[PDB]
Design a protein around this ligand. Structure first.
Ligand SMILES: CCCCCCCC(=O)OC[C@H](COP(=O)(O)O[C@@H]1[C@H](O)[C@H](O)[C@@H](OP(=O)(O)O)[C@H](OP(=O)(O)O)[C@H]1O)OC(=O)CCCCCCC
Ligand SMILES: CCCCCCCC(=O)OC[C@H](COP(=O)(O)O[C@@H]1[C@H](O)[C@H](O)[C@@H](OP(=O)(O)O)[C@H](OP(=O)(O)O)[C@H]1O)OC(=O)CCCCCCC
Ligand SMILES: CCCCCCCC(=O)OC[C@H](COP(=O)(O)O[C@@H]1[C@H](O)[C@H](O)[C@@H](OP(=O)(O)O)[C@H](OP(=O)(O)O)[C@H]1O)OC(=O)CCCCCCC
Ligand SMILES: *[C@@H]1O[C@H](CO)[C@@H](O)[C@H](O)[C@H]1NC(C)=O
Ligand SMILES: *[C@@H]1O[C@H](CO)[C@@H](O)[C@H](O)[C@H]1NC(C)=O
Ligand SMILES: *[C@@H]1O[C@H](CO)[C@@H](O)[C@H](O)[C@H]1NC(C)=O
Ligand SMILES: *[C@@H]1O[C@H](CO)[C@@H](O)[C@H](O)[C@H]1NC(C)=O
Ligand SMILES: *[C@@H]1O[C@H](CO)[C@@H](O)[C@H](O)[C@H]1NC(C)=O
Ligand SMILES: *[C@@H]1O[C@H](CO)[C@@H](O)[C@H](O)[C@H]1NC(C)=O
Ligand SMILES: *[C@@H]1O[C@H](CO)[C@@H](O)[C@H](O)[C@H]1NC(C)=O
Ligand SMILES: *[C@@H]1O[C@H](CO)[C@@H](O)[C@H](O)[C@H]1NC(C)=O
Ligand SMILES: *[C@@H]1O[C@H](CO)[C@@H](O)[C@H](O)[C@H]1NC(C)=O
Ligand SMILES: *[C@@H]1O[C@H](CO)[C@@H](O)[C@H](O)[C@H]1NC(C)=O
Ligand SMILES: *[C@@H]1O[C@H](CO)[C@@H](O)[C@H](O)[C@H]1NC(C)=O
Ligand SMILES: *[C@@H]1O[C@H](CO)[C@@H](O)[C@H](O)[C@H]1NC(C)=O
Lengths: 278, 278, 278
């Protein structure tokens, strides 16, 4: 009975120590989250399948020509500059620019590839007969998930928040750019997880054998693909790996207890020395 | 004699504690490696010299024009569109595509630069008289080491495994693309170290003064160079830095021993209290 | 009085333990910094505002046409190929190439954008009437701070050190390349903090409606912008997060003290056993 009660008391005291360490760690985290610009760590996590991203195009006057999903290969085009073979989950929304409130931007959101293991990719074609601009390009930005946008209650605000995110790029005209997008998730101290993208473009020239009559119009090609299944995650160094902080706190508490034992021994030793001397 | 025997027993017990911690850590690692998709950390390691990589080109109908090694500068071309000055360790192998078994792909593997400190780079030229394709590009993928491929027993399987790796890109025609490749090594739980590359292309237009008769043929230029000596290494967070796990385990064991001491004191205290009361 | 003296002695012994741990950690760091090629970790740190970088162009025979600061948008060009609207903090310096001492390179350093939150960007235009070269490009490299170069005592040596850094790229002619530069700081064991850049170019074709007489001259466009406020910091794994090493050292010392206590108990136990037996 004494042995089993001692084991139970061991469990109780271990639980009490765990609770104390947890409270101290929570206090440390609550104090950290108040300060701005903390040191953040990097953690990767491979995923078998990606969540479907959203590719918000900005054709403007350009007309979407063809959208199709392919796997690790692009079949030769049947006829450039001709519509058809279009089936992508495309949602059309347009809103005021958060930066310049005076201008409204038309956004074409296309569901991105999700089977990274199968090298799934999305191929888009655009056409523009007449253009008055020095540079021919279409803006596009990538956000975390297409489903979140689809079921979002405030669609306009979500797109403005995406514009605030740093994932905007361009692709040229007369070239087919292969975009290998990478996902980077950063967790803010407030709790929200901001998402930004990294890309590795591969610009490829497009050779056109079409008659000189139609050469005035310019064709835009772009391919979106996940570079690697790994997802970069950025978080506060203390919060990202709490086990290091827990180990440090346990070491500090054990050092304090050892110091208490040392003091208890030393006071007895000095009392004995004083009694022997006087 | 008592003091020296006490020191020896200190060594024995320290060794026993180290063995116990090592066994617990090995059990933790063996349990981790079973689960899929673990959290992985990032570690960089500068290298004075790089291992020679392999650049597997896919010219197809294109003919390799010139290969040469240079240091931080490209001398002006003597005559574009003309062969000669070709000396690279090139191995020609062709095999069935692992994705689409019906197609065989011709791969030209060229030994890559290895002196990153000297900014060594490899310059390649390609020519194509007649082409029937909308986009003019040559596929290329990068694997970890050329020597491994050279001495591999199953050459075909090694190339298929490289195709499975996510390091395939393209470079355009009529442009000279400077490819700054970065090495990323990820260690799987099974033990193998998968290798993938990251690139930062710099597309540069090519101006041709050649006669209009030869303008039909298109010239491909590409330059491969190591961006930085640092090599990104990705590994499981527990296994990458085992010292954190060792420290946590030592802290846990010391906390358990402190709890044992606390129980031994508390049982005596409560027994004394009970005896005094009754 | 005894209690307060015991508390004071607790403080003294805790300070002594902290000093011992600090000395051991300093010894470990001093031993580490001697060895070459250590394992380095990655830490990110968001900044509200960036320090102004330096963009050292290499126009050569090209003449700078226009420099202007913009926010997240490029207004349409008033007239391509015409100077004016030029106000950037440009410093002109030229020096001998550290790699090839025989050639002197003319560097045009332009102060880069610093308000990443406002998506500030710098737009540059270049012109070249007559050129004798196969490829039309302008070299450029990025260093950490423009102010450091401006107030540097040895300007020539600073530029040579920047050339030694791996942050050199090119942008094509007849295209507008959007450069999204990222800051990577690596701390060497000697103490200096080398700085290298990462970029994500977005090549955009430029359509010219200018008369065929002026088509001989080629126009260069480039845009520089900070991709994200996060700054990648690379440091030795032990030095980057010293708290892990401190926790491990405290755990080791506490384990040694526990082993000492175990030996003190075990010697008494075996002495008692020997006395009972004989
Ligand atoms: C208490 C035992 C030792 C814990 C130290 C373990 C805590 C720890 O690892 O902090 C490193 C961090 C460094 O700041 P950083 O710039 O890296 O973020 O410190 C702070 O600045 C705030 C600490 C929060 C305040 C801590 C309040 C206890
Ligand atoms: C035992 C003392 C405390 C050790 C905790 C130290 C172990 C530790 O750090 O695990 C974090 C990890 C979190 O999982 P994660 O998704 O990050 O991988 O846990 C597990 O999921 C498996 C643990 C393996 C199972 C652990 C079996 C003991
Ligand atoms: C002493 C208690 C345990 C400390 C271990 C904690 C020290 C520690 O974490 O080292 C890992 C590192 C691994 O080398 P690495 O290639 O990763 O750099 O070791 C060394 O090579 C030099 C150690 C410096 C020499 C250490 C001299 C004490
Ligand atoms: C492909 O297009 C057809 C209409 O042409 C549509 O019915 C079908 O659902 C589409 N499939 C996918 C996967 O988009
Ligand atoms: C989008 O733009 C159109 C005009 O092009 C106009 O109907 C309105 O601004 C927006 N309408 C839709 C479809 O949201
Ligand atoms: C632009 O309009 C928005 C609408 O909310 C407003 O918040 C912002 O201050 C305006 N900026 C101006 C006046 O330029
Ligand atoms: C562009 O030109 C084509 C030529 O057939 C025509 O069919 C189409 O209606 C025009 N409008 C756009 C911008 O697509
Ligand atoms: C360069 O080419 C010559 C043949 O033209 C060859 O003998 C020599 O080994 C080559 N050198 C290198 C380093 O490739
Ligand atoms: C490579 O392709 C050629 C035909 O171009 C043929 O000999 C066979 O498929 C392969 N031969 C070699 C050299 O491996
Ligand atoms: C393609 O051929 C390979 C040869 O191993 C086979 O494993 C795979 O199932 C085939 N796929 C088909 C039938 O499309
Ligand atoms: C291509 O054209 C050149 C012109 O001289 C000729 O020498 C060569 O044999 C042709 N074949 C290829 C594809 O190199
Ligand atoms: C802009 O240019 C004018 C001269 O044209 C100069 O006085 C002014 O300081 C410049 N402003 C900036 C911010 O460069
Ligand atoms: C820069 O080059 C010029 C010649 O173009 C010459 O004056 C000297 O080499 C350098 N001068 C300056 C302005 O530093
Ligand atoms: C180039 O000149 C520099 C000047 O310091 C010198 O250090 C270097 O050895 C020279 N290299 C040669 C001789 O090619
Ligand atoms: C280039 O041509 C223009 C045409 O007006 C002329 O004004 C200028 O002086 C020439 N020199 C350069 C290289 O700018």
């Amino acid at each position: 009975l004494k042995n089993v009660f001692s084991v139970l008391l061991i469990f109780i005291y271990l639980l009490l120590m765990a609770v104390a360490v947890f409270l101290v760690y929570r206090t440390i985290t609550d104090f950290r989250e108040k300060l701005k610009h903390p040191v953040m760590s990097v953690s990767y996590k491979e995923v078998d399948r990606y969540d479907a991203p959203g590719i918000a195009l900005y054709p403007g006057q350009a007309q979407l020509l063809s959208c199709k999903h392919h796997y690790e290969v692009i079949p030769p085009l049947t006829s450039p500059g001709q519509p058809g073979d279009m089936n992508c989950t495309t949602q059309r929304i347009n809103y005021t620019d958060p930066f310049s409130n005076q201008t409204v931007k038309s956004a074409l959101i296309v569901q991105g590839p999700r089977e990274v293991k199968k090298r799934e990719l999305v191929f888009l074609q655009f056409r523009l007969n007449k253009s008055s601009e020095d540079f021919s390009a279409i803006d596009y930005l990538l956000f975390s998930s297409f489903q979140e946008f689809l079921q979002s209650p405030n669609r306009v605000g979500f797109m403005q928040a995406c514009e605030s995110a740093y994932s905007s790029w361009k692709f040229s005209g007369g070239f087919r750019t292969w975009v290998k997008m990478s996902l980077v998730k950063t967790k803010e101290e407030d709790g929200r997880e901001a998402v930004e993208f990294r890309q590795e473009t591969s610009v490829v020239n497009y050779i056109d054998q079409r008659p000189a009559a139609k050469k005035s119009a310019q064709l835009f090609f772009v391919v979106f693909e996940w570079k690697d299944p790994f997802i970069q995650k950025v978080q506060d160094i203390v919060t990202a790996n709490p086990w290091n902080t827990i180990a440090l706190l346990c070491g500090a508490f054990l050092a304090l207890f050892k110091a208490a034992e040392f003091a208890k021994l030393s006071i007895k030793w000095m009392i004995k020395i004083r009694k022997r001397y006087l």
